Paper text:
To better understand the spatial relationship between ADP-ribosylation and lipoylation attachment sites, we determined the crystal structure of SpyGcvH-L. The structure contains residues 1–110 and is comprised of a barrel-sandwich hybrid formed by two β sheets flanked by short α helices. In comparison with previously solved H-proteins (RMSDs for all Cα atoms ranging from 0.575–1.14 Å), the most striking differences observed in SpyGcvH-L are (1) the position of the β4/β5 loop (residues 38–40), which diverges from the consensus path by ∼6 Å as a consequence of the presence of Arg72 in the β8 strand (a position usually occupied by Val or Ile); and (2) the absence of a C-terminal α helix. Intriguingly, the missing α helix, which is held in place by electrostatic contacts between four conserved residues in the canonical GcvHs, would occlude residues implicated in ADP-ribose attachment in SpyGcvH-L (Glu24 and Asp27). The absence of the steric hindrance imposed by this α helix may be a prerequisite for the GcvH-L/SirTM interaction and thus could account for the high substrate specificity of SirTMs. Mutagenesis showed that the lipoyl-attachment site is Lys56 within the conserved Ex(2)Kx(10)G motif (Fujiwara et al., 1991; Spalding and Prigge, 2009). Only extended exposure revealed slight ADP-ribosylation of E24A, whereas no ADPr incorporation could be detected for D27A. These findings suggest that Asp27 is the likely ADPr attachment side, but further indicates involvement of Glu24 in the ADP-ribosylation mechanism. On the other hand, Glu24 is only present in GcvH-L homologs. Since ADP-ribosylation is a known modification influencing protein function and interactions (Barkauskaite et al., 2013), it is interesting to speculate that the MARylation state of GcvH-L might regulate the availability of the lipoyl moiety for redox reactions. This idea is supported by our finding that the ADPr attachment site is in close structural proximity to the lipoylation site. Strikingly, SirTMs show absolute selectivity for the lipoylated GcvH-L. Altogether, these data show that lipoylated, full-length GcvH-L is required as substrate in the ADP-ribosylation reaction.
Residue numbers in the entry: 1 to 112
C-alpha cells in the first residue's frame, strides 16, 4: 500500500515502511549534490532523517511517521545522483518498523 506525506512516498510491505523521494519533491528542490543522514534510530514525527543540498534549495527530509530505523540508503551519501533517479532501488531514503497502523492509514493515498 502506498501513501504520500511531506512529498515523500511511503510504501507498506508487511511490518516495513519504505520512505522514498517523489518526482514532485525532486522537481521542487532540483538536482541533489549532497546527502547526509542523521544517526537517530528512533524517530518521532518531524524528526530529521536526511539533510540535502540541491540546486534550488537546501532542505531536511522530516519523518511523517514515528518509527524505528532499520535501513538507510547510505549509498546516497557517496553517490547523491541516486536520489535524483526514478528507480525505486536508487531513490529510497529509509526503511522503518514499529510504525502505528492507524497513523499510516491516515496519510493521503499516493496518486491522489
Amino acid at each position: 500500500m502506498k501513501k504520500i506525506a511531506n512529498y515523500l512516498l511511503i510504501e507498506k510491505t508487511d511490518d516495513r515502511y519504505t520512505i522514498s523521494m517523489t518526482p514532485e519533491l525532486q522537481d521542487d528542490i532540483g538536482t541533489i549534490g549532497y546527502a547526509e543522514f542523521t544517526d537517530n534510530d528512533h524517530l518521532a514525527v518531524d524528526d530529521i532523517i536526511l539533510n540535502l543540498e540541491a540546486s534550488k534549495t537546501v532542505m531536511s527530509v522530516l519523518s511523517p511517521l514515528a518509527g524505528a530505523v532499520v535501513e538507510r540508503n547510505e549509498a546516497a551519501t557517496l553517490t547523491p545522483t541516486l536520489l535524483n533517479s526514478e528507480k525505486a532501488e536508487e531513490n529510497w531514503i529509509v526503511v522503518l518498523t514499529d510504525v502505528d497502523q492507524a497513523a499510516f492509514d491516515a496519510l493521503e493515498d499516493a496518486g491522489s
